[PDB]
């Protein structure tokens, strides 16, 4: 099988309903104060290999 073809979705703060599809492969940034105090930081990929 693929060495890095399987990845999990490291995320929090938005507990989801049962049987919910989450394909939102989006960079986790806030663009406001609660991310290093500026926009574009703490913008780490939630996906982890």
């Amino acid at each position: 099988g693929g060495n890095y073809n399987y990845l999990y979705r490291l995320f929090r703060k938005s507990n989801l309903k049962p049987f919910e599809r989450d394909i939102s492969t989006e960079i986790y940034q806030a663009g406001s104060t609660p991310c290093n105090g500026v926009e574009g930081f703490n913008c780490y990929f939630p996906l982890q290999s």
Partner: protein
């Protein structure tokens, strides 16, 4: 601060300290914690640190 082989200890207890004022501070090179969500640090009580 002393050397790594003689690193300095201190005991802290009976305090009311806020980590949010420190979490958003940008004067740190790296702040990564193991198994503890920083945003919830204000909602836990410990015996000492």
């Amino acid at each position: 601060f002393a050397s790594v082989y003689a690193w300095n200890r201190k005991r802290i207890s009976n305090c009311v300290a806020d980590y949010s004022v420190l979490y958003n501070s940008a004067s740190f090179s790296t702040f990564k914690c193991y198994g503890v969500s920083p945003t919830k640090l204000n909602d836990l009580c410990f015996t000492n640190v």
